[PDB]
Amino acid sequence: QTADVQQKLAELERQSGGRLGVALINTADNSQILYRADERFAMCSTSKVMAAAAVLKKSESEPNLLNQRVEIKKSDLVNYNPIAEKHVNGTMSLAELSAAALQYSDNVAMNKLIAHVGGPASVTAFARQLGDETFRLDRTEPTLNTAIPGDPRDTTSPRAMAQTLRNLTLGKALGDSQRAQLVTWMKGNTTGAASIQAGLPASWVVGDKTGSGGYGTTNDIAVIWPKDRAPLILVTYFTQPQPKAESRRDVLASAAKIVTDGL
């Protein structure tokens, strides 16, 4: 069964033409399915989870933080800001920016989360404090998505991100209020229907965060509640050889189906 899954993932990777990274943690039996799980991949917008979590951690000692008002200026706009562009010259709260970053992948929102915890090195130090040595957020939006092969900036490994996502969503990295808030935000994601969700039965409940970037980089990280089962954590990262390659969300869906068949 395990050899079969490995063969199927290798065949999927070969067909895709790119480089595939998978880590599944099954909390029913504390098992894992790993494929290139210690290699680095550009996170792209999947890094928005760590930034939102760092804001939530800060809020544990700062009860006015989520309500804090943040001005949205023309000079804050970057390349993709579906929510923030509606609020130029007004303010949004940090809770609203967290939701926009997580549920729409809004880049202004991500930059405000980064800024309000101290910058990329502070988001990285938060990961370190959780026991994640691998995660590195080097840059802000939009440059963190370049995803150049061989470039370690703005990368993590599938294993590291799966273990950290377990801690954030199912474990004790965050206090109960803050963990529940992260889970609710991720369950409300609007961007993930073509990725991991597309490879799972319709009845399963998912909280996920997608990402895309240069070199056809196509990513998704998820917490999954299968029908009447203990939850799963799944990271699917994918990147391609050509600078202008198009996204391959089908590859993420295929990987999700391969690693969950039988559950």
Ligand X SMILES: *[B@@]1([O])O[C]([C]C([O])=O)C2=[C][C]=[C][C]=C21
The residue ranges that bind Cl ion (CB under 5 A) are 130-131, 164, 167, 201-202
45 noted as active-site residue: yes
- Which of 155, 157, 181, 212 touches ligand X by CB under 6 A? 212
Residue 69: CB minimum distance to ligand X, A:
25
Site size toward ligand X, by CB under 6 A: 12
Q: Name the residue nearer to ligand X (CB basis): 105 or 197.
A: 105
- 176 CB-side CA count, 13 A: 0
Q: Applying CB under 6 A, which part among 58-66, 113-121, 205-213, 224-232 lies near ligand X?
A: 205-213
Q: Name the residue nearer to ligand X (CB basis): 26 or 136.
A: 136
Residue 162: CB minimum distance to Cl ion, A:
10
Catalytic position from the list 45, 105, 195, 254: 45
Query: Does 44 participate in binding ligand X (rule CB under 6 A)?
Result: yes
* Residue sitting closest to ligand X (CB): 45
Q: Which residues bind ligand X (CB under 6 A)?
A: 44-45, 80, 105, 107, 142, 145, 191, 210-213
Catalytic residue numbers, as ranges: 45
